[PDB]
Symmetry: C4
Amino acid sequence: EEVTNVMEYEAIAKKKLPKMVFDYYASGAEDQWTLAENRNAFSRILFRPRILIDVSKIDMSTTVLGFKISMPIMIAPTAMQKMAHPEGEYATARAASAAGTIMTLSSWATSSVEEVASTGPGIRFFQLYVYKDRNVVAQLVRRAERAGFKAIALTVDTPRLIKNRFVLPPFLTLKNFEGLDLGKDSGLASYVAGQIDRTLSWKDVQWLQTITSLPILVKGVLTAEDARLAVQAGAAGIIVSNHGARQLDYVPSTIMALEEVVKAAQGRIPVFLDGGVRRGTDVFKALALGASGIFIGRPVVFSLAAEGEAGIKKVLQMLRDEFELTMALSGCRSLNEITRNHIVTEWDAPRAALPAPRL
Amino acid sequence: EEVTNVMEYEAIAKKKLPKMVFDYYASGAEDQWTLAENRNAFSRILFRPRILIDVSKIDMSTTVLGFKISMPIMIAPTAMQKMAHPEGEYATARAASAAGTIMTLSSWATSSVEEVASTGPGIRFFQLYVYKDRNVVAQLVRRAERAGFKAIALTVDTPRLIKNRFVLPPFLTLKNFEGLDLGKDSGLASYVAGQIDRTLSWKDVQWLQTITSLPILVKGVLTAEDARLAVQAGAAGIIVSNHGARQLDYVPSTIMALEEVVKAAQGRIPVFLDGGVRRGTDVFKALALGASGIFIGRPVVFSLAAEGEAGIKKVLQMLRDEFELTMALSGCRSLNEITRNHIVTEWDAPRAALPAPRL
Amino acid sequence: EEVTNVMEYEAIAKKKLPKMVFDYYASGAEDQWTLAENRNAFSRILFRPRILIDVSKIDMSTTVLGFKISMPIMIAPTAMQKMAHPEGEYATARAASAAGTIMTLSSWATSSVEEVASTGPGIRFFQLYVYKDRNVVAQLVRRAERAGFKAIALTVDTPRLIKNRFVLPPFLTLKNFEGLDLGKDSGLASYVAGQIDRTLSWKDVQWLQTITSLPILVKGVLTAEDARLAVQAGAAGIIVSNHGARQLDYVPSTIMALEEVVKAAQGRIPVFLDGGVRRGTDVFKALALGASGIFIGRPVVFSLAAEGEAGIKKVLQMLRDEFELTMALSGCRSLNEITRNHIVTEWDAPRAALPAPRL
Amino acid sequence: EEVTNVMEYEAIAKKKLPKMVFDYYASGAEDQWTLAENRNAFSRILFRPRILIDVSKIDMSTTVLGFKISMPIMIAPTAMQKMAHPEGEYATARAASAAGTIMTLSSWATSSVEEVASTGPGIRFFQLYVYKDRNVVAQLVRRAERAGFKAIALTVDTPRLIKNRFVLPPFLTLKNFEGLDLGKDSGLASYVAGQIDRTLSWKDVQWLQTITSLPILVKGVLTAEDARLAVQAGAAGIIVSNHGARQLDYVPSTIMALEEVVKAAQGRIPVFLDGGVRRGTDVFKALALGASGIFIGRPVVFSLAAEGEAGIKKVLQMLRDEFELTMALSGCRSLNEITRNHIVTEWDAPRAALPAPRL
C-alpha cells in the first residue's frame, strides 16, 4: 500500500477506530463540523507565478513568538489522543519535536504537560479554557509554566452549543486536571465539561495576564473589530478559526476573514489560520493572505490512529513537501517572498481591466 | 419517533391530509407557490460572529405596535384551519397565546374573531381584503374591534390571478362572514371569492382609516417606492411578502427587497418579512437585514395537521431555540444587537479588499 | 388532450413532420441554432412589482411604424410554410389578421405577397435579402408594394455560413420569385440560394431607399455601434436578432445587447427583439429592456404544423394571456408603464446597497 | 469514417499509441496537465459581431518576427515525435511548410535541426533549455543557426517538478545532442534530463544574447511584472503558457493573464498564447485579447499519430477554416480588424449599464 496525501489517512482512521471516536474527531464533540472545511474557498484562489527566479534552495523556516521553527506548519490541539492510539500525545509530541515544529496540547489531553515535556526538548503551546474556578486556571497555567510550555492558546467558545459522545475507559483520564485542587464529585470528565465559563469577555483575557507572563493567543477572531480588540487586550497573537455549526446552517467563512483580520491587526501581532488546511497549496494561500502560519488538527489525529508517530511524521512531511513545491512554482525562495500578489481571489479587482504603466 | 425541525412536519401533513387540502396550503389556492421559497437566498447570506461577549442570557423579547411579545416570530394567516385539524383556529389561538406571540386570523377562517377571543387573552391581528361592498368591510372591522383585535393586516393582491380547490364540508363555514348583512345567493364561499375588489389603490388604504382607528399593516410591498407610499398613506407597518407565480415563471425576490424596503421606510414604521422562514438562522438574517420580526404560515398549519395545538407549540419552540442559539453564536444578547454588520450578503462590498484603519 | 403552453407545440410538430423538415425549422437551415435560445438569460431577469395600482383593465395595444396593432407581439418569417401545413402562409396571414397583429412574410415563402393579400386586410411586412441582381430586388419590392405590404424586414446575413436540407415537392415553389424576370437554369431553388450577395454593406441599405419609400427594418444589430449606423443609414427600425452558430461555439447574447442597442438608438427608431420569446414574462422583460415589441418565429410554424390556423391562433392567445397577467402582476396598465425599473438584471447595481433618500 | 474537429484526433491517438506514450503527450512528462485546458475560460468569452461589413474576402496572413506566414496559427514543440509516428518531425516540418506556417522543433526531438532543414524551405524556431553546461547551449544554438532556424523559444521551467515515462527504443535518439561535445555516461537520455539548470534567472536570458543574434522568445510569462522584465531583458517576444500541476492543485489562468501581459508589454514585442487552443473561436478570442498568434502542441502530435503528415495538414486546415468563419461572423476582414471590442469577458464593465452618447 501507499499513502500519497494528507486526506488519505482519513479513510484508514475511519476503519481503525470505533465510529463514535472517529466522528468525535471528524465532526467534533457534536455533529456540527464539516470535513470539507475551506476546500471550496481554497479552490477559488488561483496563483500568479513569477518566472526566472532561482528557487533551487527554498527556505521555509520562520519565527513564532520568538521561537525558530522549521516550517509555518504547526499542530492544533485534539483531545484525549490515547483514544486514537496507545501512545497518544507522547507520539504527537515526539513527531512535532522531530519535525522541528510546535505542538499545542489539548486542555483535555490524556497526557499531562509534564509527560509531554518528559519526551524531550520542544516548543509547545497549551490550550486553555477559562474555567469558572479561576484558581483552577491558575494551577493549569503554573503546571504548564513548570513543564516548559511557551504560550497559551485561549479557546473562547463553549463546546456545549449529544450523538458523538463516548466514555474514556477507566485506565485513561484528563491528566492535566489530575492532582489539582478542585475544592469541594460525579467524575472528572463531568467536572471539566460542566465548569467551562459561559460569561467570558475581553476582561477575562486581561485577567489572564495578571496570573501569567506567557504570550496569549486568542482563537476564534473572525472580524476586523475583534482583531483590533485582541491587540488592545494585549493578545500576543490571533488564531482565525471557526468550524461552524452545520446542522443549524450556521456558516462563517474563515478564509474571507483571514485577510481582513490580518489587515486590522496592522502588523502588531501574528495571525494564524486553523481549519481545513490539507495541501501545500492551502498553506501557501493562507500565508499570501497574510497569515504567519497555520495549524492542522484532524490530519494529525487521523495519521496517529493509522500509523502512530510514523503517520504524524508522514503527514507533516507531505504537507511540507507540497508547500516547498508550491513556493518553487510560484517563484518564492522564502516565506518573506510569499506576497499578496502571488495569489488572486474572487474579490480582487481584475488586473486585466487595469491600464498598464509606462509614461 | 422524533421531529427535530420545522420542515419535518411537512411530510406528516402530506400523509395526514387529502392531497388537495395539502396542496392548497403547500402551494396556495392555485399551484403558483414554491415550497422552497427563500431557501436559496437565505443560504447565500453568511454570518460575521463576534467573540468574547457574555451571551449566557439572551433577551429576544420585542414590541410590536406597542404590544410586548416574547419573540420576533409571529403567526401568518392560513385560511379554513378546521380543514387541517378539528380544533382549527382555536388551536392556533391557544398556542400563540401560550408562546406569548401574535396570531393573525385569516379573513377566511373557519372560526370567527369572537370564537378566537373566547379562548382567552392574547394579542391578535386580523387579515382583511377590501371587498367591493365597503359596508361589509365596515362590519368585519367592527366585529374584530369588538373581539379585541389590535391591527389590520391588509392583503392587497387578488387570489384570482383551478386545480387546488376543494369544498368546505357542510358543517364548516367562513365564520367571519356569518351573520353579516350582505344585502340582496350561490353560497357563502362563492360570495367571498367573487366580491374581492380588483380596483384597489392607495386611496383605499386611506379610506380604511376613516372607518377604523386600528393600525393598518400593508402586505406585499417589494420596492423602495411602495415603502415610501405606505408611510405617506398612513400605514402603521409593512409586510414584505410575495409567494410568486411559478407556472408563469414570475419570480420576485423578497429577500433582496427586504433591506431596500427597510431603508426606504426610514425608521418610520416597522417592516416585517413573510415567506419561507424555517430556521433560527433565517429569523436572524431577516432582522439583521432590518426587519422588526417575521411571520410563519405553512409551518403552523402543517404542525396543526400533524399534532394539533401541541405541534404548533413545537414549531414555535424549535424556531425559538434555533434563534437563541444563532444569536448566541453571533455574540448578540438582545434584538438591538442584531446589526447589519452581523451578516454578509452577495451584494456587500468585500471587507477584505478595504484598507484597515489606524492613522 | 390539452396544450397549455407555447413550447408544447414543439413536440406535436416533431411527431407530425418528417425529421429534416422539423430540424430545418427547429435548428435552421444548418444545424447551428439552439432551441433553448435566451431561456437562461430570461431566467436571470427578475421582476420588481408595484402594488395598489388599478390593473383591472390592461391596455397592451401599440403602434408600429404608424400602424395600430393589438399587442406588441408579431410574427417572424419562416420559409416555405406549405411544407409545415397544406394551407401554409395563407393560414399564418389569416391568424395574424384575426389576432390584429403583423405578419412578416418570408422571402422564401411557398405563397406570394399577392396570395397573402388575397386573404383580406392586414398589415404585413416582407422579408428581403439583397440579391446580387439588383433588378430582381426591384421586382420583389414592387410586387410587395402592389400587394399592400408596409415595410421591408432586411436580413443582412448569409444562410450559407448541409445536413438539414430537403427538396420542395414539385407542386410547391418559391412563389415570390415565380414570374419575375431573372434574365439568362438549374432550378428556382438553386437560383435563390446561389444569388444572395456576400458583399453587403451600409451603402446597400442606403441604395434600398432609392428604389422604395417603404420603411426599412434592419435585422441583426447587436451593438451600440451598428445601432448608430442603422439610424444614420436611414433605417426605420432595428431588429435585435442572431440565432448563433452552436457547432462553431459561436454565441452572441441578444438579450445583453437589447438594452445597449435601444440606448444607442436614442429613441430615434423602434427596436425589436427576435429570438426565443416563449412566455408572457419574456415579452414583458424585452419591453422593460426598451424593445418596442417582439417577433416569434418557431412557435408559429410548430403550431401551424400541429393544428394549422387554429394552432397559430392559440399560440398568439397564450402568449397574449400570459403577457397581460405579467403586466397585471407588475402593476402596469399599459405598455408605457413597462419601465426599466420593473425588472432587475444581473448587471444592475444592487438597490439594497444604495442609501435611501429623505433629506 | 470522418474527422470533423481537432479534438477528435485525441481518441484515434489514444487507440493507436501505447498508453504511456499517449499519456506523456496528453498529460505531459508527469501526470500534471489537464486535457481540458482553457476550455472553460474560452467558453465564458462571448462575441460582439458587427454587421454590414464586406467579409467575402478574409485576409488572415501575418508577420511574425519579420517573417510572413499564412495564418496566426503555429506549431508548438512536442518531444520525440518518432514515438508518435515513424516519420516524426519530418512529417511535422513538411506539413508546416506546406501550410505556410512556423514549426518549433523540440530540444528533445528524435530528428535534428539539419534533418528538419533537409526537408526543404520553411521558417522554423528551436526550443531551448538553458543547460548547466553553457558550451553545450552554444553548440545547440550554432547547429540551429547553421540549419537556418530563425528564433529561440526559451523554455524557462524545469520538467522535474514518475508514472508517465517510457524508454526510447535503441533505433531512436535525442538527435540534437548527437555528435556534440559533452565532455567527460549513463546514456544520452539521462544526460539531457539531468543537466537542465535549476538556477535560471533573467541574467541568463541576457547571457543568451552574447552567444547568438537570433530573436529570443521567453515562454511562461503570466504576469505584468515578468512581461516588463522580458522587454527590459531584450526578449523579442513572449509566450503566455503554463500547463499547470493538477495533482498539486496548482492552477494558474493563462487566459486572464494574456490580456494583462499584452498590456504590460506596451506594444514593444509580440505576445503569443500556447495552451488548449482547439477551435477557430479560440484563435479569435486570443487575438482579440491582444495576442499576435497562438501555438498548438497536442493536436499536432495526435493527428500525427493518427494519420501522419496528412493528419497534421488536416488539423491545421480545420483550425484555419473555423478561424476564417469566426472572423467572417464577427465582421473582421483582416487580423488588424480583430479588436478587443469584438469580444466580451466576465471582467468587462457591462456596456448595457453605460449611458449612450449623443450630446
